[PDB]
Design a protein around this ligand. Structure first.
Ligand SMILES: Nc1ncnc2c1ncn2[C@@H]1O[C@H](CO[P@@](=O)(S)OP(=O)(O)OP(=O)(O)O)[C@@H](O)[C@H]1O
Ligand SMILES: Nc1ncnc2c1ncn2[C@@H]1O[C@H](CO[P@@](=O)(S)OP(=O)(O)OP(=O)(O)O)[C@@H](O)[C@H]1O
Ligand SMILES: [Mg+2]
Ligand SMILES: [Mg+2]
Ligand SMILES: [Mg+2]
Ligand SMILES: [Mg+2]
Lengths: 193, 193
């Protein structure tokens, strides 16, 4: 698990307007919901051999191809499958949160950025505290894609898109992604399949 | 423990232009550096009773007042101490990275956002994968402060600032912080003491 550059697919699934919830609903609700969400999102990544890199609040950072090697295509296959499954999971999550009173508060939507690229994946931090993650623009991209894409929209990088049939690529488009000294070709892929 | 709202001080220390490194220096250098950095940053938080909530890449998210209760004042005291110590740690880190060839690549600088406020801190995620973190605008604030403040500048929220003597508050100022439906009173505090 020592940090090494690795072609991995970083999938970031951030909940759209989660702050609009961490203020709207109650703390327990925010946790219950978040945890429920992350439970299903995580489920979505793990179910897709994904690796929950970490949760950055309402954002899930899934790595594909790390720590367990995974073909770039699988990484994307999985990441996209995860992203989509997450949306499906979210479909039910909102169904339940709506029918419960946790949403209905905008029906929890999540932006998903999936990028594949060289990231230094491995354990990072002090020996006093290390977390397996991916470091590098690759990650940034995924994250920026995540935040760049519309709610319940899976925005993947050019790198990722090449694995998804054009039919599933709703719309390609370069986007000025923060931290990216170059317009990244983003392809929001079909949230379904 | 289980997620509960908690007045905690979220400290985010993100490395300024780390992507300008995850591209500049080599992977091993990026990891070696990042880990070295996070090692000292982490050190800085733990040494200040802080809690490394997680590392979000080059960003360290430290919680103060979670999971171990800590007086709001201590939280800030510690968070600020950490932020400052981090800068000091970074001072030496760059000293070494510079004298090594890892920087000199802009001398790794870090933005530090320290905010104190109600956050739902506790374990989040699925039982399949839980991470102790703080959720809620409080965190967002710290993060936005972190990214809002200039490099090697510790930007704390009004909440935090009240604990730091005005003499240490380099400059107060409200900032349109993303995700914050209200101008947050940010106070970049003296990075020294
Ligand atoms: N537990 C946590 N750990 C680390 N970073 C966190 C965090 N919680 C928040 N942040 C940081 O705070 C930032 C913004 O917080 P949101 O993303 S929770 O707010 P939003 O209403 O959901 O906004 P939208 O999803 O764009 O619609 C995150 O990107 C993190 O850097
Ligand atoms: N290991 C990781 N875990 C989670 N999120 C991560 C991540 N690495 C990156 N991100 C996400 O990618 C985003 C940007 O990546 P940078 O911060 S590494 O790039 P920069 O040049 O340092 O940017 P600047 O510090 O503003 O100058 C982060 O905010 C995370 O949401
Ligand atoms: Mg979010
Ligand atoms: Mg987020
Ligand atoms: Mg950074
Ligand atoms: Mg960061």
């Amino acid at each position: 698990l020592r940090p090494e550059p690795r072609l991995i697919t970083i999938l970031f699934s951030d909940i759209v307007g989660f702050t609009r919830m961490s203020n709207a609903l109650q703390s327990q609700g925010v946790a219950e919901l978040l945890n429920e969400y992350l439970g299903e999102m995580t489920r979505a990544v793990f179910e897709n051999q994904g690796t929950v890199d970490k949760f950055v609040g309402d954002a899930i950072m899934a790595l594909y191809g790390a720590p367990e090697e995974m073909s770039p295509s699988e990484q994307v296959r999985r990441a996209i499958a995860t992203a989509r499954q997450m949306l499906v999971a979210l479909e039910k999550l909102n169904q339940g949160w709506q029918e419960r009173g946790l949403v209905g508060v905008p029906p929890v939507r999540f932006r998903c950025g999936i990028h594949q690229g060289m990231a230094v994946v491995g354990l990072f931090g002090s020996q006093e505290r290390s977390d397996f993650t991916a470091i590098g623009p690759s990650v940034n991209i995924a994250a920026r894609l995540q935040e760049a894409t519309a709610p319940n929209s899976i925005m993947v990088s050019a790198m990722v898109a090449q694995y998804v049939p054009d039919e599933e690529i709703i719309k390609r488009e370069f986007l000025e992604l923060k931290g990216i000294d170059e317009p990244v070709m983003t392809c929001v892929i079909n949230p379904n399949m």
